[PDB]
């Protein structure tokens, strides 16, 4: 396994409820599932969203079980869908999102680098909601249709990247850029 390529997201699911009070003798139970860097980070994000959408926090919310309900097969190949909401330096804007990877864990996280590179939206400004599964033909994005084509090809004109072993400073002569 290679640590450099991998992010640090795993599955979890923790269940609880708001505190049963004298006023609320029989409160209802609720749940929601997001992934983040850590289980604690995801719990904090969940409580922030609970405070923003409803009125409850740790002072009036408790949890009564915890489990790690991982995926059916992490080695699968998927196409899912989520909903993005973010803010710029002058307003707020929303859209949807879909991407392909092996599992939801990185499926959540491939988006942040693109957002930061393009719109300089720091991760504290983006909101992602309602993960589900998308179709392969329903996508109206330009790039993602050729992903599941019947047959496709392109060359490999990327520049070489050798090891620190063989990145020797003084070369006998100039290298080329064809390879293969």
């Amino acid at each position: 396994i290679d640590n450099s390529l991998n992010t640090n997201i795993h599955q979890y699911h923790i269940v609880g409820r708001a505190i049963p009070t004298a006023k609320d003798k029989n409160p209802n139970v609720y749940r929601m599932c997001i992934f983040a860097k850590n289980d604690t980070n995801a719990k904090s994000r969940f409580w922030y969203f609970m405070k923003k959408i409803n009125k409850l926090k740790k002072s009036n919310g408790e949890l009564l079980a915890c489990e790690q309900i991982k995926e059916r097969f992490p080695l699968r190949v998927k196409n899912y869908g989520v909903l993005l909401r973010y803010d710029s330096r002058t307003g707020t804007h929303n859209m949807y999102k879909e991407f392909r990877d092996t599992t939801k864990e990185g499926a959540i996280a491939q988006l942040y680098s693109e957002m930061a590179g393009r719109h300089r939206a720091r991760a504290s400004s983006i909101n992602i909601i309602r993960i589900s599964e998308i179709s392969s033909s329903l996508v109206r994005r330009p790039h993602i249709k050729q992903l599941l084509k019947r047959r496709l090809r392109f060359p490999a004109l990327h520049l070489p990247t050798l090891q620190k072993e063989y990145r020797k400073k003084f070369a006998s002569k100039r290298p080329s850029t064809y390879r293969m």
Binding site: N28, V29, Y30, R31, M32, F49, K52, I53, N54, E62, L64, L83, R85, T92, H93, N94, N127, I129, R130
Partner: protein
């Protein structure tokens, strides 16, 4: 440049909405005893015996009782230390404290609980629980009753 007796008391000594008028009839009907904790709350309707600038809303022991006045022992912080101060105010400006009723019922509880506990010879503690972590219990959440919610986008 202005440090009068009632300076800066525009709102502190102002009478509350709907609360204008002299004190109620039986406000004069409180059994005050010596060494009794009591709050000192100014009543601007009564002018004699008015509590001074800083002691409004404070609490202190009763060290003096007169025919219509009360001497209250209130600790006041000045510079580098707290020192005792004896303030003599009329009884309309005095309201019986609610610090000792927290333990009055506790000390009645003692004479009925600790007595029976010892006479039957059990060990039971009485200190306040300062409850933090909730205990562990077996629960039954209904699969029909369980309902799901989710967050919301921008609008």
């Amino acid at each position: 440049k202005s440090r009068g007796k009632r300076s800066g008391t525009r709102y502190k000594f102002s009478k509350k909405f709907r609360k204008h008028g002299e004190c109620t009839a039986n406000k004069y009907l409180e059994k005050l005893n010596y060494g009794d904790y009591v709050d000192i709350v100014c009543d601007s309707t009564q002018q004699k015996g008015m509590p001074f600038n800083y002691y409004h809303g404070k609490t202190g022991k009763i060290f003096h009782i007169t025919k219509r006045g009360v001497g209250v022992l209130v600790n006041k912080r000045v510079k580098h230390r707290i020192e005792q101060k004896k303030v003599c105010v009329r009884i309309e400006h005095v309201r019986k404290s609610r610090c000792n009723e927290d333990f009055l019922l506790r000390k009645i509880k003692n004479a009925e609980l600790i007595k029976e506990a010892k006479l039957k010879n059990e060990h039971i503690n009485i200190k306040r629980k300062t409850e933090g972590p909730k205990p562990a219990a077996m629960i039954k959440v209904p699969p029909s009753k369980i309902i799901t919610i989710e967050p919301l986008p921008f609008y």
